[PDB]
Enzyme design. Structure first.
Site, PDB file in Angstrom:
ATOM      1  N   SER A 152      -0.295   9.999   1.050  1.00 51.88           N
ATOM      2  CA  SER A 152       0.225  11.222   0.465  1.00 51.88           C
ATOM      3  C   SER A 152      -0.650  11.932  -0.586  1.00 51.88           C
ATOM      4  CB  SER A 152       1.580  10.882  -0.182  1.00 51.88           C
ATOM      5  OG  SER A 152       2.501  10.731   0.858  1.00 51.88           O
ATOM      6  N   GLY A 153      -0.909  13.214  -0.447  1.00 51.86           N
ATOM      7  CA  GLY A 153      -1.663  13.893  -1.472  1.00 51.86           C
ATOM      8  C   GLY A 153      -3.167  13.915  -1.161  1.00 51.86           C
ATOM      9  N   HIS A 164       4.847  16.456  -3.938  1.00 53.00           N
ATOM     10  CA  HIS A 164       5.779  15.319  -3.902  1.00 53.00           C
ATOM     11  C   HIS A 164       5.187  14.094  -4.553  1.00 53.00           C
ATOM     12  CE1 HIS A 164       4.023  13.758   0.000  1.00 53.00           C
ATOM     13  NE2 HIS A 164       4.451  12.593  -0.545  1.00 53.00           N
ATOM     14  N   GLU A 179     -16.807   3.630 -10.354  1.00 50.88           N
ATOM     15  CA  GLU A 179     -15.590   4.316 -10.716  1.00 50.88           C
ATOM     16  C   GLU A 179     -15.718   5.126 -11.958  1.00 50.88           C
ATOM     17  OE1 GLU A 179     -15.941   0.890 -10.420  1.00 50.88           O
ATOM     18  OE2 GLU A 179     -14.472   0.238  -8.943  1.00 50.88           O
ATOM     19  N   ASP A 229       3.974  22.066  -0.431  1.00 51.60           N
ATOM     20  CA  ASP A 229       3.743  20.700  -0.998  1.00 51.60           C
ATOM     21  C   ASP A 229       2.319  20.596  -1.503  1.00 51.60           C
ATOM     22  OD1 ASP A 229       4.136  18.099  -1.761  1.00 51.60           O
ATOM     23  OD2 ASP A 229       4.133  17.300   0.331  1.00 51.60           O
ATOM     24  N   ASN A 272     -12.798  -0.228  -3.168  1.00 49.52           N
ATOM     25  CA  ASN A 272     -11.744  -1.242  -3.252  1.00 49.52           C
ATOM     26  C   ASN A 272     -10.943  -0.925  -4.513  1.00 49.52           C
ATOM     27  OD1 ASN A 272     -10.182  -3.553  -3.830  1.00 49.52           O
ATOM     28  ND2 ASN A 272     -11.564  -4.736  -2.516  1.00 49.52           N
ATOM     29  N   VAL A 327     -10.620  -3.822  -7.224  1.00 47.95           N
ATOM     30  CA  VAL A 327     -11.807  -4.516  -7.789  1.00 47.95           C
ATOM     31  C   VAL A 327     -12.642  -3.460  -8.434  1.00 47.95           C
ATOM     32  CG1 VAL A 327     -13.864  -5.929  -7.259  1.00 47.95           C
ATOM     33  CG2 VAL A 327     -11.725  -6.266  -5.976  1.00 47.95           C
ATOM     34  N   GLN A 364       2.437   6.059   4.601  1.00 48.67           N
ATOM     35  CA  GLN A 364       2.940   6.041   3.249  1.00 48.67           C
ATOM     36  C   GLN A 364       1.794   5.542   2.358  1.00 48.67           C
ATOM     37  OE1 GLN A 364       3.527   3.523   0.587  1.00 48.67           O
ATOM     38  NE2 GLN A 364       4.345   5.326  -0.434  1.00 48.67           N
ATOM     39  N   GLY A 365       1.568   6.252   1.270  1.00 50.72           N
ATOM     40  CA  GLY A 365       0.445   5.903   0.367  1.00 50.72           C
ATOM     41  C   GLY A 365      -0.786   6.766   0.550  1.00 50.72           C
TER      42      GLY A 365
HETATM   43  N1  LIG Z   1       2.397  10.053   9.453  1.00 45.56           N
HETATM   44  C1  LIG Z   1       2.286  11.095   8.395  1.00 45.56           C
HETATM   45  C2  LIG Z   1       2.892  10.674   7.056  1.00 45.56           C
HETATM   46  C3  LIG Z   1       2.350  11.223   5.925  1.00 45.56           C
HETATM   47  C4  LIG Z   1       2.760  10.828   4.676  1.00 45.56           C
HETATM   48  C5  LIG Z   1       3.748   9.890   4.465  1.00 45.56           C
HETATM   49  C6  LIG Z   1       4.305   9.309   5.556  1.00 45.56           C
HETATM   50  N2  LIG Z   1       5.311   8.284   5.250  1.00 45.56           N
HETATM   51  C7  LIG Z   1       6.196   8.286   4.188  1.00 45.56           C
HETATM   52  C8  LIG Z   1       7.006   7.194   4.367  1.00 45.56           C
HETATM   53  C9  LIG Z   1       6.507   6.603   5.566  1.00 45.56           C
HETATM   54  N3  LIG Z   1       5.430   7.213   6.071  1.00 45.56           N
HETATM   55  C10 LIG Z   1       3.860   9.702   6.804  1.00 45.56           C
HETATM   56 CA   LIG Z   2     -12.628  -0.159  -7.517  1.00 38.61          CA
END
Ligand SMILES: NCc1cccc(-n2cccn2)c1
Ligand SMILES: [Ca+2]
Ligand SMILES: [Cl-]
Length: 223
Positions: free
Chosen positions: A177-178, A40, A62, A84, A54, A57, A174-175
């Protein structure tokens, strides 16, 4: 990561950030040429950023390397999030060192109760939004299949597991992910989905990497 801790710079050396002008997903380095992430998180024009702490920065460890190829799992369903998982090949090989290092693939599935490290640059609040600059970490156990299924009726396949805390408070978000879930030194999960973050009875759901090892190896062997 909600309810986690600052990892410390470069203490999670397989963690990468996928960047398309901005961080949008985590991933895990599995050899000098290849990253594991969530299907996804697919998009074109990915730059893989290794050696990050960070992400705003330039701190001196890196490596920024553009993707040459993305491969989404052949059975990925974006509606159910079954399968996924994707692989991303780097246009040039990373320089491996103590701060930029691959994570071993599992040789068997991990059990419920096993301790794991989940990491990322995702949201740190369960209500509200605040994105950290430095990498956050969370130690969390894998939950039983039966409690995962009862938490999310009709939604957990054999390619998913739950990890975290049924009480809430500590979860991926969120963020994240992956990104990786590593247990006893093996990549056992990929941050995949959840209903909100850190809510009671709604733990995180993770792609079950041990189901994919023969697809990962034979894909790398021919690409
Ligand atoms: N709490 C697990 C989880 C994993 C990945 C993404 C989310 N998410 C997407 C939108 C809001 N939170 C939640
Ligand atoms: Ca950095
Ligand atoms: Cl879904």
């Amino acid at each position: 990561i909600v309810g986690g801790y600052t990892c410390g710079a470069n203490t999670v050396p397989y963690q990468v950030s996928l960047n398309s002008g901005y961080h949008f997903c985590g991933g895990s380095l599995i050899n000098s040429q290849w990253v594991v992430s969530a299907a996804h998180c697919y998009k074109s024009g990915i730059q893989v950023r290794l050696g990050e702490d960070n992400i705003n920065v330039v701190e001196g460890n890196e490596q920024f390397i553009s993707a040459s190829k993305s491969i989404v799992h052949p059975s990925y369903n974006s509606n159910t999030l079954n399968n996924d998982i994707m692989l991303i090949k780097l246009k040039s090989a990373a320089s491996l060192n103590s701060r930029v290092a691959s994570i071993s693939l599992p040789t068997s599935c991990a059990s419920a109760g096993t301790q794991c490290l989940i990491s990322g640059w995702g949201n740190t609040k369960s209500s509200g939004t605040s994105y950290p600059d430095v990498l956050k970490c969370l130690k969390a156990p894998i939950l039983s299949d039966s409690s995962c299924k009862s938490a999310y009726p009709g939604q957990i396949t054999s390619n998913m597991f739950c990890a975290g805390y049924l009480e809430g408070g500590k979860d991926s978000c969120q963020g994240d992910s992956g990104g990786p879930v590593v247990c006893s030194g093996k990549l056992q999960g990929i941050v995949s989905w959840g209903s909100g973050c850190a809510q009671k009875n709604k733990p995180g759901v993770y792609t079950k990497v041990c189901n994919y090892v023969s697809w990962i190896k034979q894909t790398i062997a021919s690409n």
